Write a protein that binds this ligand. Structure first.
Ligand SMILES: *[C@@H](CC(=O)OCC)[C@H](C[C@@H]1CCNC1=O)NC(=O)[C@H](Cc1ccc(F)cc1)NC(=O)[C@H](N)Cc1ccccc1
Ligand SMILES: *[C@@H](CC(=O)OCC)[C@H](C[C@@H]1CCNC1=O)NC(=O)[C@H](Cc1ccc(F)cc1)NC(=O)[C@H](N)Cc1ccccc1
Lengths: 305, 305
């Protein structure tokens, strides 16, 4: 019993982290097979991040300008190339610890674990969600760029995120492992703002289920609602609209608890308008929205890797 | 910027997890050098759990009765001993992945990372606190006994917890790696309940410093109180008393922010009597008490391992 914010075991990803230095700029890299991935802004000069032409910066740089370190072991660079906003450094040694992996682009509302790293070494691991405005609410300091986000399916590590920057709001932005930024953000020192961040409704509902599975039931009422009468209340409170795909994806949880999605939706509508009245759910005084239905099923069924 | 519930990287511990089977019962064990540690109720079914005489069941068992599996490979048990509630199986092969480690007994209020495992394979990692009533608020299903909690102090893995039981209230209980239970609990199916749980005052203050470090400053007032004055209110809300040792432990966070501990205490006093004004602090609507002062420093200074 119980329910916690649970990250994936970080071991398989620890073995791919390395340190990447270009000039005086050091950050983290991801070493898979004979390729080291990292943010292209590592090649930037100090006065190059204002108006950077990375294509042209890469021509000026030799393979010898890139120092990669796996532990205290130097990996010789024998090639450098740029896919979108990620630098790809070809090295002469294949990572013996390369896991079965895939590069995936995640959607808003989907969660993942982040291995925060500095100078190629891990600091900690936590669970994040891709917000509906394509930012993440992480914990990153200077030197954290190149840290990756990931999920694990049995033995396959699906890398979904690489950390690039911090917006003035304290939120975080980055790319997939193919260099495409999530959201409208770019790696130029320009005024860029995230749209209104909305609450991931399907996750709050998955979370309420998890609450039900664990014995928290004070919020369950006997009223019901329709998908449109709930969404009318939802959009007033900056909640994402609920669709039939969301009702279906919660099927498993509805089928383990016997509670109809729309029944839980009525309980949720009551909590939005009236609050919690100094009560808590799963130890929280807020409606948590960084648990997907799969995360709930995973943590209430014992899925191992 | 940012503040998340961050666990230690779990790689070093993943490489010590194995599966231990005795009869029909399987659970997780910890394989360090040539010894596997695991809960001693592995030698029990659901018949002797009334008044289990682990002394007889141990002698009545043979080395061949214990099946130990490290992934695919099978480890041959060549001896067995008991140290309180932990079983020690000597095997004929030493773990090549054994980290520098120590067995430590943690104090109430201290945190650690839990690597939840099932059938010797990790499922997830999350951060827990030893509650003042010597329970933890974990996430554990059937098959999870033997999962361990730990801290990483430099290059040394400090194992502090092995999971044994869930109490009917839904909280969890276990031992250090020497087999001594935290709290007045015993590894047998007899009536057991934890004392009343209090809030870890020193951890709440550390967390408020974390909020200040990350720009959350709305709850700061200009006031200052006395240690005795603060404790008078602390007791009214079921908060641990604040000792001078706690005050000193917060020294580093007071030094970084310029806010005296007794000034922070006055701000916490006002939050307790008047509530959080419908506002959040570091993404939470409750006062969080599972971050130690050290947890705050390492996440806000990027300590690596
Ligand atoms: C990682 C940089 C790194 O590790 O390599 C040098 C040590 C940085 C992580 C930031 C630091 C603090 N918390 C974080 O999440 N990333 C940056 O520092 C980023 C680098 C950058 C500068 C200019 C660009 F055009 C692209 C990338 N700088 C920032 O995030 C600053 N907040 C400035 C900023 C840049 C883009 C949009 C808004 C603000
Ligand atoms: C770990 C058991 C295991 O892995 O072995 C499988 C063969 C269990 C973890 C629990 C399961 C559900 N959620 C959890 O966190 N531990 C137990 O099941 C525990 C084991 C035990 C059985 C018989 C004994 F004599 C000692 C220990 N049993 C329980 O937790 C039950 N809640 C019963 C109970 C025991 C002590 C105090 C209160 C209730």
């Amino acid at each position: 019993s119980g329910f916690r914010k649970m990250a994936f075991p970080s071991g398989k990803v620890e073995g791919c982290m390395v340190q990447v230095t270009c000039g005086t700029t050091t950050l983290n890299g991801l070493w898979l097979d004979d390729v080291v991935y990292c943010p292209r802004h590592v090649i930037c000069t100090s006065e190059d991040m204002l108006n950077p032409n990375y294509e042209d910066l890469l021509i000026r740089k030799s393979n010898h300008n890139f120092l990669v370190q796996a532990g205290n072991v130097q990996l010789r660079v024998i090639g450098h190339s740029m896919q979108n906003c990620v630098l790809k450094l070809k090295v002469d040694t294949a990572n013996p610890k390369t896991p079965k992996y895939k590069f995936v682009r995640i959607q808003p509302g989907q969660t993942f674990s982040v291995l925060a790293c500095y100078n190629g070494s891990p600091s900690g691991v936590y669970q994040c969600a891709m917000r509906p405005n394509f930012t993440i609410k992480g914990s990153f300091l200077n030197g954290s760029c190149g840290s990756v986000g990931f999920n694990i399916d049995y033995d396959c590590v699906s890398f979904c995120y690489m950390h690039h920057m911090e917006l003035p709001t304290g939120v975080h932005a980055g790319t997939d492992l193919e260099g495409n930024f999530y959201g409208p953000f770019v790696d130029r020192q320009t005024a860029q703002a995230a749209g209104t961040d909305t609450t991931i409704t399907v996750n709050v509902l998955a979370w309420l289920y998890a609450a039900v599975i664990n014995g928290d039931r004070w919020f369950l009422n006997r009223f019901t609602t329709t998908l449109n009468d709930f969404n009318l209340v939802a959009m007033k409170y900056n909640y994402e609209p609920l669709t039939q795909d969301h009702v279906d994806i919660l099927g498993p949880l509805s089928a383990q608890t016997g509670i109809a999605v729309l029944d839980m939706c009525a309980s949720l509508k009551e909590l939005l308008q009236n609050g919690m009245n100094g009560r808590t759910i799963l130890g929280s005084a807020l409606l948590e929205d960084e648990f997907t239905p799969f995360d709930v099923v995973r943590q209430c069924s014992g899925v191992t890797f």
